Amino acid sequence: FTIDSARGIFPNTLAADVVPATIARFSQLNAEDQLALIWFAYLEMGKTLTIAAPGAASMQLAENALKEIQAMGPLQQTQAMCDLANRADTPLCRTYASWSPNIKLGFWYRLGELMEQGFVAPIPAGYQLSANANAVLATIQGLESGQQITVLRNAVVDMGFTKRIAEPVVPPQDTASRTKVSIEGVTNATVLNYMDNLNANDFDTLIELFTSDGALQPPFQRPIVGKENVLRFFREECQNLKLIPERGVTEPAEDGFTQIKVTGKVQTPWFGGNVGMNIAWRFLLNPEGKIFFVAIDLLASPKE
């Protein structure tokens, strides 16, 4: 049994690979078209969904970068934003690249407000997207909201130029206030402990469920391998999620292993209750019940 081989459990699960396909089409585009396109998507999405403000901590970490850009003349400001999209090698891009995903998003959240207010150079008035860019935005607006926000997030995290800065780790939720999840057909203690500890931000307890060499595969990314690496991923990116699993199925695997698939919804704190993402979890447990591998899949539709 290998991690890479474990990637193939439950092969009928239809993942929303329109998300990675759409990101790839986006990445082909001219940098100004990327910027205009996100700007457009945001303004038109923002009419029905309201994004949550970035936390105080994240705002503080982005503040110097946000001030340096605002101080520059209007062309330099547009050049700085193109450099991020083109993944150019500048000091700003290196700083952007060391940020955690929440800070990159908080940074762009704030540039968007300043562009609305007119204090940072906005997208030229009446600008028109290229043929390819219009098709890419057309595709995004046809996606359900959960897939829409995942496309926008991933385009934003990909900017910059490849020390690592993240927000402070929130202390785990006090035990007496923890609700527990219930899953039709799934009484497996490891899976239930997986949801409950993640909903409580109790990463130290969560990581103990994994084998030493175990792996976690977030949506559309390569598996993250080893307790050290998976715990880091928890701490930098998985605070304040809300996991709402609904049903599951349990099957034996090779070597006395067990494979469990659960489907349900997740809410990210950036949108709270206004975007429910349809998610599947695919677990491969070893004979003592440790997680050897868990994949998280953004589902292609609710009919899955």
Ligand X SMILES: CC1=C(/C=C/C(C)=C/C=C/C(C)=C/C=C/C=C(C)/C=C/C=C(C)/C=C/C2=C(C)C(=O)CCC2(C)C)C(C)(C)C[C@H](O)C1
**Residues 65-94 interacting with a copy of itself (rule: CB under 8 A):** 82, 86, 88
Helix residue ranges, H only, 46-127? 56-71, 74-85, 91-98, 101-117
Instruction: Give the contact letters, 141-170, x = binds to a copy of itself (CB under 8 A), - = no.
Output: xx----------------------------
Separation of alpha carbons 239 and 139, rounded Å: 30
- Per CB under 8 A, the list member of 56, 71, 131, 189 interacting with a copy of itself is 131
Separation of alpha carbons 234 and 238, rounded Å: 5
Binding residues for echinenone: 32-42, 78-81, 105-115, 123-127, 149-159, 194, 238-243, 266-277, 281
Work out how close the CB of 286 gets to ligand X at its nearest, in angstroms, rounded to a whole number: 19
Here the tokens at position 34 are 């990327």
Binding residues: 32-42, 78-81, 105-115, 123-127, 149-159, 194, 238-243, 266-277, 281
Binding footprint of ligand X on the chain (CB under 6 A): 35, 38-39, 42, 51, 105, 108-109, 111-112, 115, 149-150, 152-153, 156, 198, 218-219, 237-238, 241, 243, 266, 268, 270, 277, 279, 281, 296
Separation of alpha carbons 36 and 122, rounded Å: 9
How distant, in Å, are the alpha carbons of 26, 128, 189 from that of 267? 25, 34, 23
Choose among a copy of itself, ligand X, none what residue 25 binds, the Cβ cut-off being 5 to 8 Å by kind.
a copy of itself
DSSP secondary structure letter of residue 176 = G
Separation of alpha carbons 112 and 214, rounded Å: 39
Work out how close the CB of 275 gets to a copy of itself at its nearest, in angstroms, rounded to a whole number: 15
Query: Is 288 exposed, middle or buried (CB count within 10 Å of its CB: 0-12, 13-18, 19+)?
Result: exposed
Choose among ligand X, a copy of itself, none what residue 153 binds, the Cβ cut-off being 5 to 8 Å by kind.
ligand X
Separation of alpha carbons 56 and 45, rounded Å: 24
| Residue ranges binding a copy of itself (CB under 8 A) | 4-5, 7-15, 17, 20-25, 27-28, 30-33, 40, 43-44, 82, 86, 88, 125-126, 128-138, 141-142, 184-186, 220, 247-254, 261, 300-301, 303-304
